[PDB]
Amino acid sequence: EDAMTVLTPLTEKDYEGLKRVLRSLQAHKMAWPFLEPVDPNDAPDYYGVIKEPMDLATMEERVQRRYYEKLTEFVADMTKIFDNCRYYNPSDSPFYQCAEVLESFFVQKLKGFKASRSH
Numbered sequence: 001e002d003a004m005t006v007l008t009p010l011t012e013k014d015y016e017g018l019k020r021v022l023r024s025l026q027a028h029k030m031a032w033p034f035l036e037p038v039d040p041n042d043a044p045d046y047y048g049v050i051k052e053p054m055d056l057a058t059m060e061e062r063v064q065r066r067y068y069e070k071l072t073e074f075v076a077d078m079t080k081i082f083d084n085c086r087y088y089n090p091s092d093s094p095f096y097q098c099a100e101v102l103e104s105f106f107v108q109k110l111k112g113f114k115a116s117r118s119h
């Protein structure tokens with residue numbers, strides 16, 4: 001990551017952009033498994049294996065409360081969603097496929113956000 005991403009504080013204008021990025025992911029057709037925390041009734045062994053769970057509703061709460069100080073911290077939480085999914089599920093599962101698709105989409109939107117900060 002470049003120096004702006006790591007070290008430039010998130011301004012109010014930056015936060016409006018983060019809200020838009022998040023809403024785009026929440027509206028994606030392949031985002032359904034990630035919208036809310038993993039349901040322990042459906043996955044009884046999940047919280048024993050995955051030590052730092054993450055989901056898009058937890059990220060929305062954090063954005064609203066201005067939890068993030070630097071872009072790198074927002075990117076780290078998002079990346080945790082996808083990394084947790086690829087570690088827990090096998091490579092041939094529909095969950096794994098959704099992570100592949102949605103991470104690619106996130107990278108496209110994140111590049112757009114970074115461009116709009118510098119110009």
Ligand SMILES: CC(=O)Nc1ccc(CN2CCOCC2)cc1
Pocket residue numbers: 033034038039042043044046084085088089095
């Ligand atoms: C985002 C995420 O990883 N979700 C998730 C949801 C349920 C399970 C539990 N299993 C999966 C396949 O077998 C039936 C139930 C595992 C992972």
